[PDB]
Every structure is written in structure tokens, then in C-alpha cells.
Amino acid sequence: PHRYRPGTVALREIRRYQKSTELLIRKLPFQRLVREIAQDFKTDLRFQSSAVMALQEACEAYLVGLFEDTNLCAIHAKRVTIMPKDIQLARRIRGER
Amino acid sequence: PHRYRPGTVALREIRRYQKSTELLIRKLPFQRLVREIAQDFKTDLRFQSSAVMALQEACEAYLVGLFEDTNLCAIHAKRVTIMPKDIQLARRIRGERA
Amino acid sequence: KRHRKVLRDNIQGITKPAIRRLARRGGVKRISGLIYEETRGVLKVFLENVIRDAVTYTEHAKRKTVTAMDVVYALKRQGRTLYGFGG
Amino acid sequence: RDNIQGITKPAIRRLARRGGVKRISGLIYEETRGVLKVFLENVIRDAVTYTEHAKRKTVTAMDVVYALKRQGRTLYGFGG
Amino acid sequence: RKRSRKESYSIYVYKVLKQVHPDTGISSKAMGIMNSFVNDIFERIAGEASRLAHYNKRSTITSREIQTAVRLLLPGELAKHAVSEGTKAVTKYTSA
Amino acid sequence: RKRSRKESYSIYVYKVLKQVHPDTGISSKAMGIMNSFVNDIFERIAGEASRLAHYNKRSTITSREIQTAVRLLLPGELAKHAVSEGTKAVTKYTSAK
Amino acid sequence: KAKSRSSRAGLQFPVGRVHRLLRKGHYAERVGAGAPVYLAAVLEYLTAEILELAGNAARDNKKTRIIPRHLQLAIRNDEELNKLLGGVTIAQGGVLPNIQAVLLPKKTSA
Amino acid sequence: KAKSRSSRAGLQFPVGRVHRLLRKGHYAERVGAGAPVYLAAVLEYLTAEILELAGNAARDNKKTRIIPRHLQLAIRNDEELNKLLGGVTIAQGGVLPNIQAVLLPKKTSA
DNA sequence: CATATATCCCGGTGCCGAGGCCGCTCAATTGGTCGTAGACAGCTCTAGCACCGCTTAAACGCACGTACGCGCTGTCTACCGCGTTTTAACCGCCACTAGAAGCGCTTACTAGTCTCCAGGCACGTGTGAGACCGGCATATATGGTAC
DNA sequence: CATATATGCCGGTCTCACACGTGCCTGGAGACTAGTAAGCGCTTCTAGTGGCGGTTAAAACGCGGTAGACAGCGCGTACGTGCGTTTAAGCGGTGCTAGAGCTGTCTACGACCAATTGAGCGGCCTCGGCACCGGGATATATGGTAC
Ligand SMILES: [Cl-]
Ligand SMILES: [Cl-]
Ligand SMILES: [K+]
Ligand SMILES: [K+]
Ligand SMILES: [Mn+2]
Ligand SMILES: [Mn+2]
Ligand SMILES: [Mn+2]
Ligand SMILES: [Mn+2]
Ligand SMILES: [Mn+2]
Ligand SMILES: [Mn+2]
Ligand SMILES: [Mn+2]
Ligand SMILES: [Mn+2]
Ligand SMILES: [Mn+2]
Ligand SMILES: [Mn+2]
Ligand SMILES: [Mn+2]
Ligand SMILES: [Mn+2]
Ligand SMILES: [Mn+2]
Ligand SMILES: [Mn+2]
Ligand SMILES: [Mn+2]
Ligand SMILES: [Mn+2]
Ligand SMILES: [Mn+2]
Ligand SMILES: [Mn+2]
Ligand SMILES: [Mn+2]
Ligand SMILES: [Mn+2]
Ligand SMILES: [Mn+2]
Ligand SMILES: [Mn+2]
Ligand SMILES: [Mn+2]
């Protein structure tokens, strides 16, 4: 029986996804959420598939950006684990409130 | 004799200076620094008195802002003391630093 | 004259795995269990702001279809400019 | 000796206090002088660049305002 | 001498100040912040409006563009009211 | 039929691409990102030029405004090289016509 | 004969001045008749909304004349004006009083 | 004659097209003859400056064709382009490989 | 040292997207016209600068010591890695039509032009809001000591 | 509890900025004309939507255990206070004059025009780059083991 030590696969994954550019959220779930949120602003809206892709590109870009800043705040607190309070300080200092 | 416990005057000063809106850097030391930095871009330069005020208003504002965010970063690390590393994290997250 | 499936709780399609992958590209190694709801919260606020603006552009153009350009202008407005979709 | 030092320990303290800072590290003061300088540099560089273009030898408040605007630090009450 | 002339919104801030606070005044500095404020928001709404026109291949900035602009520019509540006072004054102006 | 006429900088990007990297090509998406880049920086310069004119009660955006724009808007060594390349093309144009 | 469009629209804010600034400002080839009316209306509203709260902030301070602080206090204590002027600095405004709770002394008698 | 004003300036970028987009662009009543030449030159420069670094990245990745990742690598690794495009998202760019030190496993005699 | 398990790197294979030929056609170039923006130079007198010498207030440096940062330790459980089972994304195809995108007709809208008429300005005033402030009142931090 | 001190406040005093009345002047607002932007009909057909089933990669769950979060400790000194000392900022001042910036003349240059033509576009056709795959060479983490 073989077993990696906690964090060995995490590093592996960091390298894997920082090499790649493929979108990391599944396409259909994201779309349903775009339709769901758009429907609540206006009924009977259609989307050019590019407008969804553009929206997904912008969303993942934003979230990867935010996990970086989060991670720095985690590390600033002599920790290695990101926590809601990390996200919250990142967003506060960004001015997103 | 009489002595205020360390922390108490500091809080009074926070209360005091948050109450007021007066500029907190002395005007002439500032005015000399503005001219000093300006010389390195264009020589034989003259300043409207208002332009030096504007720069000083925008500088103090910016720094007072940054200390707010520096203070939050210090508190994040379970401290009460702001440290260079707090200013650096604030500036990094703001987008100013890399 | 055709029933559209009523859309409900689709923010949960932003799964734990997907959020973790996003954190990985961000060079995050360890993740609290409370991060995935916190994240969904933030994503949802982000998407609502862009789509509010996007749809505003559409409504102004008197269109019923949201365009890639509408999203791009929305994003530019919010200071999150995006190359590779026109504009 | 330099003009930057004219931005004194107590001045920086006052600024921090208005910021709500209770306790200040000794190293802060130099770090802040570094930050302040980069701020003035970036702002003044643009202000002068505006002066240059108006073919003036006097930097106006309108220069600084348009400069502060460019840098995303819009100032009100000097001719915005 | 030479006189020289430089406009402002100073009068209109005062006329509005007397509507909402009839026995209250305002320092020249504070008048400058109100003046900066008006020109800023003007620039913003005009600008957004300008782009709205361009994005749709239209050569006119109509009250429509000024509205869509205000809706993008102002937060939830402030926008609701803005769109009221705006539509109202347009309606009042065309009838007279 | 015969879809409407859409302009693009993609003809001049390929030209400069062959100047700089004669055996290197470019993908649809890459060319798209290059188009968004040229449109973006155009607008940034054209706007800061428009403001310089206005701030100085001038009815005309001249090469002198483009220049100051480029000084404000490009960082250090990129501005220096841009200005020189700019000034040159003006000078070369001034004498030709 | 001759009466200001400002009055026709029931506005203190100069509809005519605004129409000029829209045309003079190179925003579009042409400017509609409603555009300066609508815009002036919004501008006047926001002016009122700020002055309303700024006037208040003066009474609370026991002063008849609005100073920059009253405008700051007004803008930073209203959620929606503070978002609109998030990126704005009000000269001689100061900041809202706000010590972080962790910085306050012990006091554990409640 | 009919010789491209592009050629008069010794540029690949279309001086005439840029002259149109400046006039049609709600920018100013009047546009000089220099402006579009100067502008098209700066656009051509910046295009070349990034296509150089993006071509180099493509060749390092054993590929004939520049793809967005190549532009992302080109732009983020160059100090001055990264600052110019600091507030820009390149669709399908990805991120620069960067793992903070404190996350890397200890006891490595490499 | 030994071995298990990812990742890299290789040619081989097949698809389809980049890129190059074509022919049609707009928007850009010519070249002549005309209106005015702005270049240039003179003049004015605004307001920026600079040497002076008081008078404080603010900066400085010093020395005490206390609360806080910081490194150590030990507890404990939350979070990681992995095997199994569950699920729904993806793919490739249908079939269906909304509405996007484009064209031609047509006219209220607005811009451009004169003339006029008061709305908005720079000026000049005099006076009341508020800055200052002495000294007095109130709130609160701080330590003593007896429980 | 009492004592020390910082701050708040009163009521009076003064001063200078505000807010008013008064020209005066230019920048608009009533007509008025004349051409274009855009509104609104009609048509084409693109691509957005919704549905189905085969395949399987990703998601979900539960398990087990490790390494990281956290809290409590204790040590050392970097700070905050407060004092006596030094320094220079601020100020009111009296010049001194660069230059901001205003006015008035005169090209040079840029818009507008509206026939002429090749630059650049949408199709269309097609290979060669590269996606995808599996075989073999390392590279590393983990764990067996001998010392
Ligand atoms: Cl020019
Ligand atoms: Cl209108
Ligand atoms: K002067
Ligand atoms: K469609
Ligand atoms: Mn719903
Ligand atoms: Mn190969
Ligand atoms: Mn002139
Ligand atoms: Mn000591
Ligand atoms: Mn220690
Ligand atoms: Mn239809
Ligand atoms: Mn006046
Ligand atoms: Mn006093
Ligand atoms: Mn005590
Ligand atoms: Mn009692
Ligand atoms: Mn008592
Ligand atoms: Mn009183
Ligand atoms: Mn009076
Ligand atoms: Mn038309
Ligand atoms: Mn199915
Ligand atoms: Mn367990
Ligand atoms: Mn514990
Ligand atoms: Mn041609
Ligand atoms: Mn050809
Ligand atoms: Mn090949
Ligand atoms: Mn393989
Ligand atoms: Mn081991
Ligand atoms: Mn051994």
C-alpha cells in the first residue's frame, strides 16, 4: 500500500493547474448559474455562447486572483491554510468591501 | 508621580486626530520635498501655493488610508503593532506593489 | 407555448473540487472547509454585478439576447477588462 | 539632512493615529518615507508632464488634480 | 484692467441648499467640494452616455442614454430616485 | 447573404509578426487578444489626448498631444522607445508629403 | 418673451449650460433636447441629497455653515453615496471616528 | 499618385484608418495630420514589442503558433508590459508558475 | 538503498484551423476651397519667491519599564489522500424558430445662424458666523489600601 | 473609595469671509432654415434552445491518520510616556519680478467636397501544425531495511 504525505498532492496540483489555461469550473453548471442569476434581473434572456465563455473567463480570472491575495493573508498570519477571514481581508483591502 | 499606562495616550491621539481635519505634516518640510522630487523631472519650476496644498491633502489622505489597511493586516496576524510587512501586504493586495 | 425548467440552487454547481482547482492555480496548498460556501458567496456577488451591467447594455440595445460585447463592456466598466471576445 | 527626513517620526505617528493605529514599529517610519516618496514621484511626474504640455514654468493645482485623477486618487475642492 | 471670467455651479448649489436647509450656509472650500462633485458626476454620466451611443452606432446622446448611464453609474436606491427626478423634469419640460 | 464587413488590425499584426518572427504563426484567439490590445491602447491614448486638448482649450488633437498622452500612459523605457518611434514616423511623413 | 428651460423643467440646475457642456465636450455628434434636462435633474437631485445630509451634519455639530467635514461625515455615513464617491478624496474632510475593538482596553465588567 | 500615408511614415499600421477612428471617435472637433501617424507608430511599436516576447515564448514551448498562454507569459514576465496591462485579463492565458516558499516541503539536500 | 508512482518526452497518427488565392468594393487618396485655430509677440500686474527676526510650538533625545512580539511546547481534530460508488457532464446528434442583423423609406430633430435680452459674473460692502480663549466644570484614568 | 488631568463648555470678543446688492456683458434662447439620423416598417437565416442516449470522467462519500491550527507559557526588549532641551516652522513683513495669461494680428492647416481606385475584406480551398495517444526514460516521494 502506497500513500502520499498530506500536502504532496496539493503542491502537485498547484504545478498542474499553474501550467494549464483550461477553465476549471464545469461548463453546464456555470451556464445554469448565469441563466439563473440573469433570469432574476430579467426574464426571457438569451446568451451568445461567447457571452457565457467571456463571463466564465472573467469569473475564474477573478477567483484565481482572489485566492492568491487570500493565500498571502493566510501566510501573513503565520498560517498555510486559507480561511474565510483571509478572503474577507483580501476583499476589504481591495475595496470590494 | 503620575504616569498614563502605555496605550492610553495613543488611544486619546486616535480619538483626537480622527475628530480633526487639519494637515498633520508641517507645510514647509513638505513643500521642500515636493520641489526636491519635482526638480528630478523638470528644472526651474514654480508652484501655485494651492498646488502644494492639493499634493499634501492627497498625500495625507492616501497615507491615512494605507495605515487603516496596515492596521487591519497587523490585527490579522493577532498583533496590535503595525510593521513594514503589514504596509507591504496592504500595498501588494491594493495592486500598488508586485 | 413550452415550459422552461425553473432554475433553483445552481450556485451548488460551483462544486468543492472546482473551487479547490481554482485555489490551486492561485498557489493555495491548504483550504479550510468554510472556504467553499465563502467562495460561492463571493462568486455570486461578482456574477450579479457583471450580469446586472451586461443586461443593462442589452436592454438599452433593445435586444433579448446578451452578447459577448455586452459582457466585455460590463467587465470594462467594473475595471476587470478582458481580451479575446471582441472590443 | 535630506528633505524626506523633514517628514518626521511624530508627523508619521499623527497620520497613523488618524488611521487608527495604536502601536507603531520603529522600522515603519523609514518604510512610510519610502511609500510617500513613490506616491509624490508618480503624482508629480504626471503633474509636471501636464505643466510641460501647457508650456508653463508654474505647476498649477489643476495639474495636480488631473494628475491625481489619472492615478485614480480624484481630489475634490481644488478645481475638479 | 483685464477682469477675466471663470464659471461654476455655485449659484445652483445655494438655490438647492435653500430648498433643503433654508437657514443653513456653506464655506467657499465646501462650495469647491460641491463644485468638484457636480463636474465629476457630469463627466461620468456624459462619458457612459457617450459610450452607450457609440456601442449602438448612434450619433445622438438622448435622455434615454443619460438614463441607462445613470442606471450603470449610481447605486441601487440613488439610481431609482435619479431616474424619477430625471423622467419627471423631462415630462414637465415637454408639456410646458 | 455575404456577412457584413467587420474591420480588424489582424492584417498589420501578421505583417509585424513576419517582420519580427518570419517562421512563427498565430492562433485565432491569440490574434483576437492582439486586436483587443490595439483597440484598448488606441482608446487610452486617444482619450488622454482628448483631455490634454480640452484642459488647454485646444480644438485639435496634434501629434504633440498623442506624444504627451504616451508619456503619461506608457511606463518608462516603453514610453522612451514609443516616443522616438512616434516622432520618427511624423518627421519621415512631414518631409515625404 | 424668453423664459429659461430650467423653469420649464422645474429645475434650479441650468439645463442650458448643461446642453452647451454636452455639445462642447465632444461626447457625441449631436445632443437631444431631453438629455440636458434629464442630466441637470439627476445632478440637482444628487446635489440636494448630499446638501440635505451635510446640512444635518452641521446642526449635529451646532454650526449654521456647511464646512468640508460636514460633506465627508455626510458621504461616509451614507452607504450609497460612499460607494459613488469610493474613489474620491474630500479636501479638509478628515475620516469617520473608528477605533478597532481589539485596540480598546481590557474592561470586562459586563 | 495614391501612395498609402502608411508608406509616407514607413509604417505597417494604417495611418488613414487611425485618422478616421480619431475623427469618428468623439475625441475633438479637429485632428492634426501628425496625430494618426504618431499614434499608428506607437501601436505598431507595442504590437512588435509583445509579438517578439510572445514568439520567443512559443519557440520555448516547441510551437510554430503564438497562443494566448504565449502572450500571457510574454506580458507577465516583462516588467513594463505587465504594468501597462496590470488591469487586463487574457482569456486562456493562465497564470505564471509561482508557489510561495513557506508551502514547499522542508529537508531538501538538492 | 529500493521501489512505486507521477511526469516528461518521443514519434505516430489524423483532423481541422490557419493562412493563402481570389474578385468585389468601400473608405481612403487626390486635389482645390475656405474658415479659423493657434502661433507669435507685445503688455499687464497676479501671485510666486525670498531675505528678516521673533516667538512659540513642535521636534528631539533620553531614560524608565511594561505590555507585547515572539519562539516553544503540547493538544486535538480538521483537512488531505485514496478507494468505491454515484452522478451528470460531455459529446454528437437531432429538430425548431426567435430574434439579430440588415435594408429602404421617410421626417422630427437638431444643428447652424441672427438677434435680443437677462442670467451669471466680478466687484465692493458691512456684519454676523465662528475662531479664539480664559477659566471653570466634568469625565475619566490611575493608584492606595483594606478586604 | 480619592487624586490627577484632559477635555468639554460658557459667554464674551473680535475679525474677516460670506452672502448680499450693483452693475455690466456675454452667452446663451426665441425664431428660423434646411439635411440628416434614426425610427419603423419588411426579409433573410443565424445560432440559440431543448431533447435524447452511450460513455465515462468527475464528483461525492467515508475512512483513517498526520501535520497544522490554536492556545497557553514564558522570556526579552521594543515600544510608549514624560521630561527637559533644541530647532525650525509659522508668521507678518516689505519688497521684487517671473511669467501667467490676455489681446490683437496673420498664416498655416484642417475640414469639407465629391469623383477615382487599390487596400482590405469575406469566401473558399487546403495542407501542415498540433491535439491526442501510448511506449519508454527519468525523476521524486515514500518506505523497506541494515546498521
Ligand atoms: Cl499634428
Ligand atoms: Cl433627448
Ligand atoms: K504669476
Ligand atoms: K440568433
Ligand atoms: Mn429565479
Ligand atoms: Mn512529438
Ligand atoms: Mn484665437
Ligand atoms: Mn531601557
Ligand atoms: Mn525572543
Ligand atoms: Mn420573427
Ligand atoms: Mn460674485
Ligand atoms: Mn482654552
Ligand atoms: Mn488601577
Ligand atoms: Mn458610591
Ligand atoms: Mn467617589
Ligand atoms: Mn459659544
Ligand atoms: Mn451682509
Ligand atoms: Mn441610417
Ligand atoms: Mn440525457
Ligand atoms: Mn477520523
Ligand atoms: Mn486547542
Ligand atoms: Mn484605397
Ligand atoms: Mn487585392
Ligand atoms: Mn509536426
Ligand atoms: Mn500518455
Ligand atoms: Mn520515510
Ligand atoms: Mn544505511
Short mmCIF file of N, CA and C (backbone and C1' of nucleotides) in Angstrom, two decimals, chain I residues 109-143:
data_model
loop_
_atom_site.label_atom_id
_atom_site.label_comp_id
_atom_site.label_asym_id
_atom_site.label_seq_id
_atom_site.Cartn_x
_atom_site.Cartn_y
_atom_site.Cartn_z
P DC I 109 -39.47 64.39 -32.51
"O5'" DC I 109 -37.89 64.19 -32.56
"C5'" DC I 109 -37.19 64.45 -33.79
"C4'" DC I 109 -35.73 64.79 -33.56
"C3'" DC I 109 -35.46 65.87 -32.50
"O3'" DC I 109 -34.28 65.53 -31.77
"C1'" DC I 109 -34.82 66.67 -34.68
P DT I 110 -33.72 66.48 -30.59
"O5'" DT I 110 -32.32 66.96 -31.18
"C5'" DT I 110 -31.63 66.19 -32.18
"C4'" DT I 110 -30.77 67.08 -33.04
"C3'" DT I 110 -30.10 68.24 -32.29
"O3'" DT I 110 -28.70 68.23 -32.59
"C1'" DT I 110 -31.24 69.05 -34.22
P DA I 111 -27.69 69.23 -31.84
"O5'" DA I 111 -26.84 69.83 -33.04
"C5'" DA I 111 -26.57 69.06 -34.23
"C4'" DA I 111 -26.37 69.99 -35.40
"C3'" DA I 111 -25.49 71.20 -35.10
"O3'" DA I 111 -24.78 71.60 -36.28
"C1'" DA I 111 -27.65 71.94 -35.63
P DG I 112 -23.34 72.28 -36.15
"O5'" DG I 112 -23.39 73.47 -37.21
"C5'" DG I 112 -24.21 73.44 -38.40
"C4'" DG I 112 -24.81 74.81 -38.67
"C3'" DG I 112 -24.05 76.01 -38.09
"O3'" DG I 112 -23.69 76.94 -39.12
"C1'" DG I 112 -26.37 76.17 -37.63
P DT I 113 -22.88 78.30 -38.78
"O5'" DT I 113 -23.85 79.44 -39.35
"C5'" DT I 113 -25.21 79.15 -39.72
"C4'" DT I 113 -26.07 80.39 -39.74
"C3'" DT I 113 -25.42 81.65 -39.16
"O3'" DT I 113 -25.75 82.81 -39.94
"C1'" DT I 113 -27.41 81.16 -37.96
P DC I 114 -24.93 84.18 -39.77
"O5'" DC I 114 -26.07 85.24 -39.46
"C5'" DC I 114 -26.86 85.12 -38.26
"C4'" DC I 114 -28.01 86.09 -38.24
"C3'" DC I 114 -27.70 87.41 -37.53
"O3'" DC I 114 -28.54 88.47 -38.01
"C1'" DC I 114 -29.11 86.04 -36.17
P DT I 115 -28.43 89.92 -37.35
"O5'" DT I 115 -29.44 89.85 -36.12
"C5'" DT I 115 -30.82 89.51 -36.30
"C4'" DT I 115 -31.56 89.66 -35.00
"C3'" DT I 115 -31.17 90.91 -34.20
"O3'" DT I 115 -32.37 91.51 -33.71
"C1'" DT I 115 -30.84 88.99 -32.86
P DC I 116 -32.29 92.81 -32.79
"O5'" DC I 116 -32.54 92.21 -31.33
"C5'" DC I 116 -33.70 91.42 -31.03
"C4'" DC I 116 -33.70 91.05 -29.57
"C3'" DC I 116 -33.26 92.19 -28.64
"O3'" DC I 116 -34.33 92.87 -27.96
"C1'" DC I 116 -32.08 90.11 -28.14
P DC I 117 -35.43 92.07 -27.09
"O5'" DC I 117 -34.57 91.01 -26.27
"C5'" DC I 117 -35.20 89.99 -25.47
"C4'" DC I 117 -34.41 89.72 -24.21
"C3'" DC I 117 -34.53 90.78 -23.11
"O3'" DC I 117 -34.75 90.08 -21.89
"C1'" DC I 117 -32.27 90.32 -23.50
P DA I 118 -35.18 90.86 -20.57
"O5'" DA I 118 -34.64 89.91 -19.41
"C5'" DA I 118 -34.76 88.47 -19.48
"C4'" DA I 118 -33.55 87.81 -18.86
"C3'" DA I 118 -33.27 88.19 -17.41
"O3'" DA I 118 -32.62 87.16 -16.66
"C1'" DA I 118 -31.42 88.77 -18.71
P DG I 119 -33.42 85.87 -16.15
"O5'" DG I 119 -32.29 84.74 -16.14
"C5'" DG I 119 -31.75 84.18 -17.36
"C4'" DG I 119 -30.32 83.76 -17.15
"C3'" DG I 119 -29.97 83.36 -15.71
"O3'" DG I 119 -29.08 82.24 -15.72
"C1'" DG I 119 -28.66 85.23 -16.34
P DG I 120 -28.40 81.71 -14.37
"O5'" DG I 120 -26.94 82.33 -14.45
"C5'" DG I 120 -26.13 82.06 -15.61
"C4'" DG I 120 -24.76 82.65 -15.39
"C3'" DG I 120 -24.15 82.37 -14.01
"O3'" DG I 120 -22.81 81.92 -14.23
"C1'" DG I 120 -24.33 84.71 -14.35
P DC I 121 -21.64 82.21 -13.18
"O5'" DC I 121 -20.97 83.53 -13.74
"C5'" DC I 121 -19.54 83.64 -13.87
"C4'" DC I 121 -19.11 85.08 -13.74
"C3'" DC I 121 -18.78 85.54 -12.32
"O3'" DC I 121 -17.56 85.03 -11.77
"C1'" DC I 121 -20.03 87.21 -13.45
P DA I 122 -16.14 85.40 -12.41
"O5'" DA I 122 -16.01 86.97 -12.14
"C5'" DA I 122 -15.26 87.82 -13.03
"C4'" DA I 122 -15.30 89.26 -12.57
"C3'" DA I 122 -14.38 89.58 -11.39
"O3'" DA I 122 -13.70 90.82 -11.68
"C1'" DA I 122 -16.60 90.14 -10.82
P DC I 123 -12.59 91.42 -10.67
"O5'" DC I 123 -13.30 92.73 -10.11
"C5'" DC I 123 -14.74 92.78 -10.04
"C4'" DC I 123 -15.27 94.03 -9.37
"C3'" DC I 123 -14.53 94.47 -8.10
"O3'" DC I 123 -14.31 95.89 -8.13
"C1'" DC I 123 -16.83 93.95 -7.59
P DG I 124 -13.44 96.61 -6.99
"O5'" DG I 124 -14.52 96.93 -5.86
"C5'" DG I 124 -15.75 97.62 -6.17
"C4'" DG I 124 -16.66 97.70 -4.97
"C3'" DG I 124 -15.97 97.94 -3.62
"O3'" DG I 124 -16.69 98.91 -2.85
"C1'" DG I 124 -17.35 96.05 -3.47
P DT I 125 -16.11 99.45 -1.46
"O5'" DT I 125 -17.19 98.96 -0.39
"C5'" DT I 125 -18.26 98.08 -0.79
"C4'" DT I 125 -19.38 98.04 0.23
"C3'" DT I 125 -19.02 98.32 1.69
"O3'" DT I 125 -20.13 98.88 2.39
"C1'" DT I 125 -19.58 96.00 1.40
P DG I 126 -19.92 99.50 3.86
"O5'" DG I 126 -21.19 98.98 4.68
"C5'" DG I 126 -21.93 97.79 4.33
"C4'" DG I 126 -22.28 96.98 5.56
"C3'" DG I 126 -21.73 97.54 6.88
"O3'" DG I 126 -22.37 97.13 8.10
"C1'" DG I 126 -20.57 95.56 6.31
P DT I 127 -23.85 96.49 8.13
"O5'" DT I 127 -23.58 94.94 7.92
"C5'" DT I 127 -24.57 93.94 8.25
"C4'" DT I 127 -23.94 92.78 8.98
"C3'" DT I 127 -23.79 92.97 10.50
"O3'" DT I 127 -24.23 91.81 11.21
"C1'" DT I 127 -21.73 92.35 9.56
P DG I 128 -25.80 91.52 11.39
"O5'" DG I 128 -25.87 89.94 11.53
"C5'" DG I 128 -25.82 89.07 10.38
"C4'" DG I 128 -24.76 88.01 10.56
"C3'" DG I 128 -24.84 87.22 11.87
"O3'" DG I 128 -24.48 85.86 11.60
"C1'" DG I 128 -22.73 88.17 11.70
P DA I 129 -25.27 84.67 12.30
"O5'" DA I 129 -24.35 83.41 12.00
"C5'" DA I 129 -24.03 83.03 10.65
"C4'" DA I 129 -22.61 82.50 10.59
"C3'" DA I 129 -22.30 81.38 11.58
"O3'" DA I 129 -21.58 80.33 10.93
"C1'" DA I 129 -20.85 83.24 11.97
P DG I 130 -21.19 79.01 11.73
"O5'" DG I 130 -19.74 79.34 12.28
"C5'" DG I 130 -18.67 79.66 11.38
"C4'" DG I 130 -17.45 80.10 12.14
"C3'" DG I 130 -16.98 79.15 13.24
"O3'" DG I 130 -15.56 79.23 13.36
"C1'" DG I 130 -17.36 81.22 14.17
P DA I 131 -14.66 77.92 13.31
"O5'" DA I 131 -13.18 78.49 13.47
"C5'" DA I 131 -12.75 79.68 12.78
"C4'" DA I 131 -11.83 80.49 13.68
"C3'" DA I 131 -11.02 79.65 14.67
"O3'" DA I 131 -9.66 80.08 14.67
"C1'" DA I 131 -12.39 81.22 15.86
P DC I 132 -8.55 79.27 15.50
"O5'" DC I 132 -8.42 80.13 16.84
"C5'" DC I 132 -8.41 81.57 16.80
"C4'" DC I 132 -8.59 82.14 18.18
"C3'" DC I 132 -7.98 81.30 19.31
"O3'" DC I 132 -7.01 82.07 20.03
"C1'" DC I 132 -10.16 82.01 19.87
P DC I 133 -6.12 81.40 21.17
"O5'" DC I 133 -6.34 82.37 22.41
"C5'" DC I 133 -7.50 83.22 22.54
"C4'" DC I 133 -8.14 83.06 23.91
"C3'" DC I 133 -7.52 81.96 24.77
"O3'" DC I 133 -7.43 82.39 26.13
"C1'" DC I 133 -9.82 81.62 24.61
P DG I 134 -6.01 82.57 26.82
"O5'" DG I 134 -6.40 83.05 28.29
"C5'" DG I 134 -7.20 84.24 28.50
"C4'" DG I 134 -8.22 84.04 29.59
"C3'" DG I 134 -7.75 83.22 30.80
"O3'" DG I 134 -8.35 83.71 32.00
"C1'" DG I 134 -9.59 82.14 29.81
P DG I 135 -7.71 83.36 33.42
"O5'" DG I 135 -8.97 82.86 34.27
"C5'" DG I 135 -10.33 83.09 33.85
"C4'" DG I 135 -11.20 81.91 34.23
"C3'" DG I 135 -10.61 80.97 35.28
"O3'" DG I 135 -11.65 80.21 35.90
"C1'" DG I 135 -11.01 79.76 33.41
P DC I 136 -12.16 80.53 37.37
"O5'" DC I 136 -13.62 79.89 37.36
"C5'" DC I 136 -14.51 80.07 36.23
"C4'" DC I 136 -15.15 78.75 35.84
"C3'" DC I 136 -15.21 77.68 36.93
"O3'" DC I 136 -16.46 76.97 36.86
"C1'" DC I 136 -14.26 76.77 35.04
P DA I 137 -16.92 75.99 38.04
"O5'" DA I 137 -17.68 74.82 37.28
"C5'" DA I 137 -18.46 75.05 36.10
"C4'" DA I 137 -18.59 73.77 35.31
"C3'" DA I 137 -18.87 72.52 36.14
"O3'" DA I 137 -19.68 71.61 35.40
"C1'" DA I 137 -16.83 72.24 35.04
P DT I 138 -20.39 70.38 36.15
"O5'" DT I 138 -20.10 69.15 35.18
"C5'" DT I 138 -19.84 69.33 33.78
"C4'" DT I 138 -18.98 68.19 33.26
"C3'" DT I 138 -19.22 66.83 33.92
"O3'" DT I 138 -19.29 65.84 32.90
"C1'" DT I 138 -16.94 67.35 34.01
P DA I 139 -20.19 64.50 33.08
"O5'" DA I 139 -19.37 63.41 32.26
"C5'" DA I 139 -18.50 63.78 31.16
"C4'" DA I 139 -17.13 63.15 31.32
"C3'" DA I 139 -17.13 61.69 31.77
"O3'" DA I 139 -16.88 60.91 30.60
"C1'" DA I 139 -15.38 62.98 32.80
P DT I 140 -16.92 59.30 30.64
"O5'" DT I 140 -15.37 58.93 30.82
"C5'" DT I 140 -14.33 59.82 30.38
"C4'" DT I 140 -13.01 59.49 31.04
"C3'" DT I 140 -12.86 58.05 31.54
"O3'" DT I 140 -11.54 57.59 31.23
"C1'" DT I 140 -12.26 59.52 33.23
P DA I 141 -11.28 56.08 30.79
"O5'" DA I 141 -9.78 55.86 31.24
"C5'" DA I 141 -8.75 56.66 30.67
"C4'" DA I 141 -7.71 56.95 31.71
"C3'" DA I 141 -7.07 55.70 32.32
"O3'" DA I 141 -5.66 55.81 32.17
"C1'" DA I 141 -7.84 57.15 34.03
P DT I 142 -4.71 54.66 32.72
"O5'" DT I 142 -4.49 55.10 34.23
"C5'" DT I 142 -3.75 56.28 34.56
"C4'" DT I 142 -3.46 56.27 36.04
"C3'" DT I 142 -3.07 54.89 36.58
"O3'" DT I 142 -1.78 54.87 37.21
"C1'" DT I 142 -4.87 55.83 37.85
P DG I 143 -1.11 53.48 37.69
"O5'" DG I 143 -0.91 53.70 39.26
"C5'" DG I 143 -0.79 55.03 39.83
"C4'" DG I 143 -1.26 55.06 41.27
"C3'" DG I 143 -0.88 53.85 42.12
"O3'" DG I 143 -0.51 54.35 43.42
"C1'" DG I 143 -3.20 54.16 42.22
#
